[PDB]
Design a binder for this molecule. Structure first.
Ligand code: W27
Length: 165
């Protein structure tokens, strides 16, 4: 069971935590990856999750792309969670540093509704360049299933909580 989360709404919870450490402790049914369309898990959340799998996530992902081609921005795929979770839901939020449409963030969060409970980061935050405050608002207004958000940066976590409405 998830522990130490602050309840923001009926279905959204948040914690200042490293999502890799959280996944290793909880072993959730679903961990969300902040993926790109190519499933190239180089940095940010994706790089960290992939490193924690000893690159097994990347190997699996490369086979997935070779068979299926790239994901769409706003889309997702379900792959193995390896040693971190039962499944990994790879979700592609828009990357503002690539000029992608921030309106696709809502479509990205809609993928979460296909899973009753998820451990997730804020989509499009961090190296994806979107405002994490906006990402949290889109999350709360889009996701209806139970989502446990892990925010690594304590300063950002405090800002997210203190500005939540
Ligand atoms: C150390 C650090 O900044 N991070 C790790 C992996 C990506 C980033 C991060 C973001 C959100 C939740 N957990 C985490 C934990």
């Amino acid at each position: 069971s998830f522990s130490g989360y602050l309840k923001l709404t009926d279905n959204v919870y948040i914690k200042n935590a490293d999502i890799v450490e959280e996944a290793k402790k909880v072993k959730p049914t679903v961990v969300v990856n902040a993926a790109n369309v190519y499933l190239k898990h180089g940095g940010g959340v994706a790089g960290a999750l992939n490193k924690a799998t000893n690159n097994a996530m990347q190997v699996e992902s490369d086979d997935y792309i070779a068979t299926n081609g790239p994901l769409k921005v706003g889309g997702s795929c379900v792959l193995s969670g390896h040693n971190l979770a039962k499944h990994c839901l790879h979700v592609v939020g828009p990357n503002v540093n690539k000029g992608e449409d921030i309106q696709l963030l809502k479509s990205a969060y809609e993928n979460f509704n296909q899973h009753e409970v998820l451990l997730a980061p804020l989509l499009s935050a961090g190296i994806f360049g979107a405002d994490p405050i906006h990402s949290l608002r889109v999350c709360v207004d889009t996701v209806r299933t139970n989502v446990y958000l892990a925010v690594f940066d304590k300063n950002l976590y405090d800002k997210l909580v203190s500005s939540f409405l």
